[PDB]
Amino acid sequence: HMSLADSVAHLSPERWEQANRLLIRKALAEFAHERLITPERDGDVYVVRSDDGLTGYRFTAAVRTLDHWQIDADSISRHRDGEELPLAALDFFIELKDSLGLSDEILPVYLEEISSTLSGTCYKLTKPRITAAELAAGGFQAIETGMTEGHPCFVANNGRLGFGIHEYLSYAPETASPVRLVWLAAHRSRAAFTAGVGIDYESFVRQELGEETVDRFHGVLRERGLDPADYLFIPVHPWQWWNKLSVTFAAEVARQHLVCLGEGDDEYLAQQSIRTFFNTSHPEKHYVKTALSVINMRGLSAAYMEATPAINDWLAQLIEGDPVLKATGLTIIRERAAVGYRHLEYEKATDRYSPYRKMLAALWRESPVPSLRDGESLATMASLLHVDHAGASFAGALIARSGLAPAEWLRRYLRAYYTPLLHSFYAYDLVYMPHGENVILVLKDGVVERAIYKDIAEEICVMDPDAVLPPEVQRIRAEVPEDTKLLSVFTDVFDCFFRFLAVNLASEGVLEEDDFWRTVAEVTREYQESMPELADKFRQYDMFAPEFALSCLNRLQLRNALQLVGTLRNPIAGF
Amino acid sequence: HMSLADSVAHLSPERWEQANRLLIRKALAEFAHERLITPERDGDVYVVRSDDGLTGYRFTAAVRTLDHWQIDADSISRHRDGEELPLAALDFFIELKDSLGLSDEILPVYLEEISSTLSGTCYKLTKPRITAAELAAGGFQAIETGMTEGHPCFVANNGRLGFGIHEYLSYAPETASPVRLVWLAAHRSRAAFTAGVGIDYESFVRQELGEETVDRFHGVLRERGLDPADYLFIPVHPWQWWNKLSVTFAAEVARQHLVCLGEGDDEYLAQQSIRTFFNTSHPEKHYVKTALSVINMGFMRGLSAAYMEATPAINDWLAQLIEGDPVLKATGLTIIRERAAVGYRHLEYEKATDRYSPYRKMLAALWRESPVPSLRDGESLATMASLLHVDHAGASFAGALIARSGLAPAEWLRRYLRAYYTPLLHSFYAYDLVYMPHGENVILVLKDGVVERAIYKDIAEEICVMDPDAVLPPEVQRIRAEVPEDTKLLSVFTDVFDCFFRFLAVNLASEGVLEEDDFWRTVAEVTREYQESMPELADKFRQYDMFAPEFALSCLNRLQLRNNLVGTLRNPIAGF
Ligand SMILES: [Mg+2]
């Protein structure tokens, strides 16, 4: 941000009321889904009352599959003492403090998170109007940075707390501001580099930075009388350097355990994960995931980091060695190298969970771009839930561009993304956290050719504690209750992603809900019928059970161990 | 900080070693004074060992009056397993974690505060290494920004946590970086202005900003369609605007409860109170004290609107009290009054919080009179903290004033005491009135090196009348308190003698300017000279005996190491 006026230009009364209307609509919809509130009918209108009962929220809505509340945002009115009141998200959460589990200690910081979400919405409303169809054809990073919703379940989901407004405008992914990494040299008595198969440190940094920059960086070390052979390069988010490391790790800088090397040349864009950077100067080079000590202090831990490339190499060999997965086109983009720093004094003074141990670390992830064949393009799977200012579905614009039948388009999408989740569960007892942000879709002519998974090591799990795995990999084992294993599919895919996709394709008039879930059931049976030898597992974990548990995402957020209250009708049980 | 190399240029191995040695010297000295550690004499050296015994710190020292440990910084050595090790402040506190009461939870944040303290010392070591005599001749703000010690008792004292390094380099007092304030218009439904006697809001802001700036700001409100009469002006620290208010109070900006007016034109310097600004473009104008949500020991500071409605009236009362007392008027004592205050009330955070939440201390400001227009010919201004200042070569700023004055040291001291100390004694005995009388909230007026008179500041939040039944105005009755009788006099013995005179006596004794016994003999004489001038308070002099043999050792570092009295000290006025 340059001037004082520009710093708050996005905050206008009009944009604010629109942002408050959209957030309250989502709060009402997802709080009702999670049975934290229970709207009552009154005529052709639903009503939700505050704790005290003196304030009423009235709206029109239709309940859809999986208890999805489809609320008209323009129908929402707020009433008290027979007087209509403006919509105000902050008042809304205060008035339902007790209905939501908001402790006295969490409510103020929750409101701050809401103010930041509302502010980001205000900023996004200042961005040029772009339609769904124009967004489909706009490019990988135009799609990444053109997302407005964020996670579709969490009400407080786009909080950039810890960023001043100038830093929000420089670093938030929706601003599409170019970012340059700061590079430190870390002494090898305190830093360690871990690489996957085929990676050599000296050639790795040469490929990433180019030899001219590497030699310039060496000159900084030698000008101080230091030997480059004793040091490792660590890339650092500028916010982390200026606001944290330069002060908190001052002792490491002064003693030359860390040396500030300079800025890197290449321009990067923050992704939806704000600490993960895509290289736009060189899209073929690695993503860089950085440590970022902002609170929800968060960061990136150096502990679990030593095995991360090996877990990625393991899973890649697993997909290649399996014709069922290779036939879906499933690939991952591997975490390929990692570097971690050990602040020995903070280590002595802290336990393993302290944010002082997550302040300096990075990892590198393969770019999906060199895998692209002719006419293929990249889109975050999150984009399938995007809706433009006119109410058009991004997924709809893809179906129209494909000229395919909607159910046929959907079947190809499910073959590429959904089928491999089933095989991983039944063949290998293997699950992910397969939400929108950690899946990249490959599109040709509007059609999903294949899927790419990312964010592997921190997310994958084998639900067999006595399964044969390499030593570096064994740590991804766990014992999961038999009743809960299958929620990996119902919660994370059905209730947290398809629920929204099916409602949006129906609302647009593209595909009825029944056909959507029919198609889902067809594809599940197709995979089932193709693997008879796994039938013992299909019976013990039935995808077609009539009900499964309702896992509530906002409830977990309002606590600071899953939050299961009640059950949902399984959409595929009668197909 | 523009450049990436400029962001850490102050951090060099040599300055860091120097800063670690100095901080360890102070920690050993003040921890031993508070009896947190007990050095053992091992021949001609003292020894302090880590909690486990594996590490030893060896140093020569002399124990001076009031159990002051004068340690030679260059004699400190660290030893483990028959090897001599480099001094490392962070290791020092981890090794003594249990002796010091550092719990598991606050130890990490304590070490971060120490790092900040150490970084600031490194920064200060890159400043021109100016001499005590030169600094004495340097003018009011050169002295203010040239202080290096900070509080003389607290080991972790100059932490600027919450600032990035670029922010430290723009805003910390020791950088002497000009700062322009940001001005907000706050709607009168959520903001309130409070004035002292003779203050009118419209003339007040016209004086401070000038008509041109004031019309430019009214313009900003008109283009938005707003009525300036519905708004109050609030100046804000730029760090506070960019890092806190524009994000946390976004609802107030959007709904136009707050409106960003722009940047004031006058250049300010941060004082040793980093949230308080002196106007360099017009030194006659008021100090501006702003809300600043930085961190102190994990806790978010700021400026609250709670006791804000009565801060001017408290200052008006104290000023009138001084003007009306012949004893105080004879010492020349004055105050620079907090004259006007303004507060904002974020109603939504109010519903969500209790009285003590940092969300209520985020937007408020007050104005303090400048001492500059009081100055007569040859008069200059110096923070009283500068009496403890020692330059790079070890020369005392006070000794430099003594040398410039041409007076015998005891006589120079006697005039300083009559100027600053006599009013404290009189305040306590005549009115049961005490202050927070430390170096940063007293300003000295100097003429030809001599202390002509003293000026107090930081009044409302610090003053206390130890009498529940004392006659006071309604808005001023809040400063009353009932504290135990054996505690009342500690406000002199602790805050004056043990936290300030202890250091000044040792500094003048180290320079060969004044022996410790002659220092305290002079304090005693000034004490008796005051008592002999007020025989009608004689019974009080004996109820609260300034000449008692001992007083309680109050331990300032003990408090800070707990986020919240052990033994006694011989009162330096024995047979004196
Ligand atoms: Mg900042």
Side-chain angles (χ1 to χ4, degrees), chain A residues 3-39 42-43 45-53 55-82 84-96 98-128 130-201 203-222 224-296 299-305 307-316 318-325 327-351 353-372 374-414 416-432 434-457 460-467 469-471 473 475-478 481-482 484-511 513-517 519-524 526-527 530-533 535 538 540-558 560-561 564-568 570-575, chain B residues 2-80 82 84-205 207-210 212-298 300 302-306 308 310-328 330-354 356-360 362-435 437-439 441-446 448-457 459-460 463-474 476 478-514 516-531 533-558 560-561 563-564 567-569 571-576:
Chain A
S3 73
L4 280 161
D6 291 306
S7 75
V8 293
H10 61 292
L11 300 165
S12 78
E14 307 79 357
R15 285 189 284 276
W16 187 257
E17 103 194 308
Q18 219 184 322
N20 275 278
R21 186 171 295 275
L22 295 168
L23 189 66
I24 284 163
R25 177 258 187 85
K26 182 184 183 171
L28 281 168
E30 303 302 308
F31 291 160
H33 173 78
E34 294 182 27
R35 311 175 180 179
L36 287 166
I37 54 178
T38 311
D42 166 79
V45 178
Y46 289 95
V47 48
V48 171
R49 263 176 262 271
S50 53
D51 298 337
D52 64 31
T55 310
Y57 290 85
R58 271 143 198 116
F59 57 95
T60 66
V63 182
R64 313 289 201 207
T65 312
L66 286 178
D67 288 345
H68 183 78
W69 287 80
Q70 186 171 358
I71 300 170
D72 192 13
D74 285 325
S75 77
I76 303 168
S77 59
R78 182 183 179 220
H79 294 284
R80 175 134 93 243
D81 298 338
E84 169 166 41
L85 299 179
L87 292 173
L90 300 175
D91 290 331
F92 177 79
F93 297 98
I94 292 160
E95 295 161 356
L96 292 163
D98 296 329
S99 291
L100 294 172
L102 283 180
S103 66
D104 295 336
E105 303 94 74
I106 285 147
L107 175 76
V109 84
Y110 192 86
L111 295 179
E112 196 176 11
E113 290 282 340
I114 292 298
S115 310
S116 191
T117 295
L118 295 163
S119 290
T121 301
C122 285
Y123 177 84
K124 280 173 273 196
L125 291 167
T126 65
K127 290 170 72 177
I130 190 139
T131 70
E134 300 172 24
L135 194 50
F140 180 31
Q141 290 294 120
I143 295 166
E144 185 80 21
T145 69
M147 308 282 86
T148 63
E149 180 62 29
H151 194 282
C153 293
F154 291 106
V155 183
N157 63 350
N158 294 326
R160 286 81 171 76
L161 288 193
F163 281 175
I165 192 69
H166 56 306
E167 295 159 342
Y168 173 83
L169 292 168
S170 302
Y171 302 135
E174 60 264 40
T175 71
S177 300
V179 178
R180 281 179 178 81
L181 294 180
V182 170
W183 286 87
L184 311 182
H187 190 276
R188 285 178 183 264
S189 66
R190 286 163 175 250
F193 177 85
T194 308
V197 281
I199 292 178
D200 152 37
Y201 170 81
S203 77
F204 182 80
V205 299
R206 196 183 266 204
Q207 284 159 20
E208 278 286 310
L209 288 170
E211 192 174 340
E212 192 185 348
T213 293
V214 171
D215 288 328
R216 184 171 86 251
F217 284 181
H218 290 351
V220 172
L221 292 173
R222 297 191 162 109
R224 310 172 141 254
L226 308 171
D227 190 332
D230 290 318
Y231 284 84
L232 281 163
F233 291 171
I234 303 183
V236 161
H237 193 303
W239 187 99
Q240 194 71 357
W241 174 253
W242 288 97
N243 290 299
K244 300 297 280 197
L245 297 171
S246 62
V247 178
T248 309
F249 282 25
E252 310 303 293
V253 175
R255 288 182 291 172
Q256 289 175 150
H257 298 170
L258 288 174
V259 177
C260 186
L261 291 169
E263 261 183 0
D265 288 327
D266 280 359
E267 289 179 349
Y268 286 87
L269 284 180
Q271 305 293 98
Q272 292 179 267
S273 164
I274 59 173
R275 58 188 185 151
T276 302
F277 290 96
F278 175 80
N279 189 328
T280 65
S281 300
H282 285 264
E284 79 281 7
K285 286 176 180 173
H286 295 86
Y287 291 88
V288 179
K289 179 149 135 144
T290 66
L292 190 62
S293 290
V294 293
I295 197 43
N296 184 18
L300 185 60
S301 207
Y304 186 84
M305 199 89 110
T308 296
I311 300 166
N312 277 268
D313 285 326
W314 178 72
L315 173 56
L318 188 102
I319 298 157
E320 186 84 305
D322 189 337
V324 183
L325 302 178
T328 67
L330 179 70
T331 66
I332 65 175
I333 43 168
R334 295 167 293 174
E335 290 118 17
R336 297 289 291 142
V339 68
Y341 193 91
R342 289 246 312 257
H343 198 295
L344 302 180
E345 290 81 12
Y346 281 121
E347 259 189 26
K348 308 222 206 81
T350 55
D351 61 3
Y353 300 132
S354 174
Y356 291 94
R357 295 192 180 186
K358 307 186 207 146
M359 288 179 86
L360 180 57
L363 64 78
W364 287 268
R365 183 180 293 130
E366 271 177 326
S367 166
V369 175
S371 79
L372 287 176
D374 69 312
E376 282 180 337
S377 66
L378 298 168
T380 173
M381 184 172 80
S383 73
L384 297 188
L385 305 189
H386 180 73
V387 169
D388 66 15
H389 50 45
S393 166
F394 188 92
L398 295 182
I399 304 177
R401 170 98 174 65
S402 73
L404 290 174
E408 183 56 26
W409 184 90
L410 172 63
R411 193 177 344 260
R412 291 217 243 270
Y413 162 63
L414 297 162
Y417 163 64
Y418 175 54
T419 308
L421 297 168
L422 301 173
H423 195 199
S424 299
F425 180 83
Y426 286 111
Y428 300 98
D429 291 325
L430 181 68
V431 294
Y432 303 80
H435 68 286
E437 289 163 20
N438 54 18
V439 174
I440 302 175
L441 302 183
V442 187
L443 299 173
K444 184 151 126 83
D445 287 316
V447 187
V448 175
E449 278 271 83
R450 57 192 177 91
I452 296 171
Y453 296 177
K454 60 201 199 34
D455 296 307
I456 299 305
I460 73 168
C461 184
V462 196
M463 313 183 287
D464 187 83
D466 286 317
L469 297 172
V473 174
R475 69 184 65 247
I476 61 114
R477 292 179 293 185
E482 299 269 15
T484 86
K485 295 159 127 83
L486 194 51
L487 284 174
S488 299
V489 167
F490 291 120
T491 311
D492 298 335
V493 185
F494 287 176
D495 196 48
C496 297
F497 193 80
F498 289 173
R499 172 164 66 91
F500 302 97
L501 179 59
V503 160
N504 289 335
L505 295 169
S507 268
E508 182 144 85
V510 198
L511 186 76
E513 300 170 37
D514 278 42
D515 294 332
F516 180 94
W517 297 101
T519 312
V520 172
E522 306 191 351
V523 171
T524 318
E526 292 172 22
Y527 169 73
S530 91
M531 301 269 311
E533 63 271 29
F538 293 56
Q540 190 177 24
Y541 311 96
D542 186 293
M543 286 291 307
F544 293 88
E547 319 182 332
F548 59 87
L550 167 70
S551 190
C552 296
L553 266 54
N554 278 295
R555 293 195 192 248
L556 316 161
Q557 214 198 0
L558 319 153
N560 36 305
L564 306 199
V565 47
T567 67
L568 291 170
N570 174 5
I572 62 172
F575 288 100
Chain B
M2 186 95 275
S3 169
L4 208 44
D6 298 334
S7 74
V8 295
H10 60 296
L11 297 181
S12 72
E14 297 67 41
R15 286 185 285 274
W16 188 256
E17 188 276 339
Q18 213 174 331
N20 275 279
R21 180 170 299 278
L22 294 168
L23 187 61
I24 283 161
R25 199 250 291 204
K26 185 180 177 176
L28 289 173
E30 292 307 308
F31 291 163
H33 174 75
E34 299 196 19
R35 297 178 185 147
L36 289 164
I37 59 173
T38 306
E40 285 163 14
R41 179 144 229 185
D42 174 316
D44 38 350
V45 309
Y46 294 92
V47 163
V48 165
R49 277 179 279 264
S50 55
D51 292 338
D52 52 5
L54 273 294
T55 316
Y57 292 83
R58 293 192 170 65
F59 57 90
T60 66
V63 174
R64 309 258 150 239
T65 303
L66 281 174
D67 296 14
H68 181 80
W69 293 71
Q70 184 177 0
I71 300 173
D72 182 351
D74 292 321
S75 77
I76 306 165
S77 64
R78 186 185 175 205
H79 299 274
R80 204 186 315 182
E84 183 183 358
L85 282 52
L87 303 186
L90 304 175
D91 280 330
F92 180 83
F93 296 106
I94 302 163
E95 291 161 354
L96 294 164
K97 170 198 167 25
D98 296 320
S99 293
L100 297 177
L102 292 169
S103 70
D104 291 343
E105 300 79 359
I106 74 102
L107 175 63
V109 66
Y110 192 86
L111 299 173
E112 196 179 7
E113 289 278 353
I114 294 290
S115 301
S116 187
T117 295
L118 288 172
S119 301
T121 301
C122 294
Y123 177 77
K124 281 177 280 198
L125 291 169
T126 71
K127 297 179 75 174
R129 269 165 60 86
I130 179 174
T131 73
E134 291 170 352
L135 191 68
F140 179 35
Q141 292 297 118
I143 294 165
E144 187 73 17
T145 60
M147 302 289 98
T148 57
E149 190 48 41
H151 195 288
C153 296
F154 289 111
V155 164
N157 65 351
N158 292 332
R160 287 88 167 74
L161 287 197
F163 284 172
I165 191 68
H166 57 308
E167 291 160 343
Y168 172 86
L169 292 168
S170 309
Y171 302 138
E174 57 271 31
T175 71
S177 293
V179 179
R180 278 170 204 276
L181 299 177
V182 172
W183 288 86
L184 305 188
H187 186 266
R188 292 180 185 264
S189 64
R190 301 200 173 208
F193 177 90
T194 295
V197 299
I199 301 289
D200 164 42
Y201 172 76
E202 298 237 67
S203 65
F204 183 74
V205 304
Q207 279 158 26
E208 286 288 320
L209 295 173
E212 206 185 36
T213 295
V214 169
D215 296 331
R216 180 188 11 232
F217 288 173
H218 292 314
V220 173
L221 290 157
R222 297 264 173 45
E223 318 216 67
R224 303 186 82 119
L226 309 175
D227 193 341
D230 292 330
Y231 287 87
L232 293 173
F233 289 176
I234 307 177
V236 315
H237 192 306
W239 185 99
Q240 193 69 359
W241 173 250
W242 288 98
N243 288 302
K244 285 301 191 183
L245 295 167
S246 58
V247 181
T248 302
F249 286 21
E252 313 297 298
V253 171
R255 299 199 291 256
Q256 288 170 142
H257 298 174
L258 286 175
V259 171
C260 195
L261 298 172
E263 207 173 17
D265 289 322
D266 292 346
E267 291 192 346
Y268 289 90
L269 285 176
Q271 306 291 95
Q272 311 162 72
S273 172
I274 70 161
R275 73 197 163 157
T276 304
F277 290 102
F278 182 84
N279 190 327
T280 57
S281 293
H282 298 103
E284 67 274 10
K285 287 181 182 176
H286 291 88
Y287 290 94
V288 175
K289 183 174 177 178
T290 63
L292 188 67
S293 293
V294 292
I295 331 292
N296 185 3
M297 258 293 150
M300 225 198 282
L303 194 60
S304 186
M308 206 92 158
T311 296
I314 294 160
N315 286 271
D316 293 329
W317 174 78
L318 180 55
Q320 182 64 52
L321 187 57
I322 304 183
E323 260 153 54
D325 189 327
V327 172
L328 300 180
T331 69
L333 175 70
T334 62
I335 65 181
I336 41 172
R337 294 170 296 171
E338 292 126 55
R339 300 288 293 142
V342 64
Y344 190 91
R345 264 177 29 181
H346 195 294
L347 306 178
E348 288 85 13
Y349 283 122
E350 223 163 76
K351 280 128 153 213
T353 45
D354 73 40
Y356 303 147
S357 172
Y359 289 97
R360 309 212 181 171
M362 282 195 190
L363 182 51
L366 62 85
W367 291 261
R368 185 178 289 123
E369 279 175 325
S370 178
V372 175
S374 74
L375 293 183
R376 289 152 202 127
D377 192 81
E379 283 185 333
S380 57
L381 297 162
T383 176
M384 189 173 82
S386 74
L387 296 187
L388 304 187
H389 184 264
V390 171
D391 71 12
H392 49 95
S396 170
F397 185 96
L401 297 175
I402 292 167
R404 200 260 182 259
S405 70
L407 300 171
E411 180 65 24
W412 181 97
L413 180 63
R414 184 172 295 108
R415 298 188 186 188
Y416 160 63
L417 290 170
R418 302 202 266 246
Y420 154 72
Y421 175 63
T422 303
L424 299 172
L425 296 173
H426 184 70
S427 294
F428 176 92
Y429 286 105
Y431 299 104
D432 306 316
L433 173 69
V434 296
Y435 309 84
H438 73 251
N441 63 9
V442 175
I443 299 172
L444 303 174
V445 179
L446 298 172
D448 294 320
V450 178
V451 176
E452 295 272 292
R453 56 191 176 88
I455 299 170
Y456 295 180
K457 68 190 197 32
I459 301 307
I463 49 158
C464 175
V465 171
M466 306 173 299
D467 184 2
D469 298 315
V471 315
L472 295 178
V476 182
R478 45 185 29 99
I479 66 186
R480 285 180 306 200
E482 166 72 33
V483 294
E485 257 57 72
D486 51 2
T487 280
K488 291 218 256 226
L489 212 40
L490 286 170
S491 267
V492 179
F493 289 127
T494 304
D495 295 329
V496 177
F497 288 9
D498 195 51
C499 297
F500 190 83
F501 283 176
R502 170 167 62 99
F503 299 99
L504 179 60
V506 169
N507 288 346
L508 300 171
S510 290
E511 219 156 311
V513 174
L514 187 63
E516 287 177 357
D517 286 343
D518 288 337
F519 181 98
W520 293 109
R521 179 170 279 108
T522 311
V523 173
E525 281 163 1
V526 175
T527 305
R528 290 191 189 296
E529 161 181 304
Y530 171 74
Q531 289 181 351
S533 75
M534 309 283 307
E536 46 287 77
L537 299 172
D539 293 331
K540 287 249 260 161
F541 298 152
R542 212 157 71 198
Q543 197 188 338
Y544 303 98
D545 190 2
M546 278 310 296
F547 301 95
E550 296 174 356
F551 62 80
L553 163 58
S554 180
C555 293
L556 261 59
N557 282 288
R558 284 189 192 266
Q560 177 192 237
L561 301 165
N563 281 333
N564 303 124
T568 59
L569 286 154
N571 171 13
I573 318 156
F576 307 94

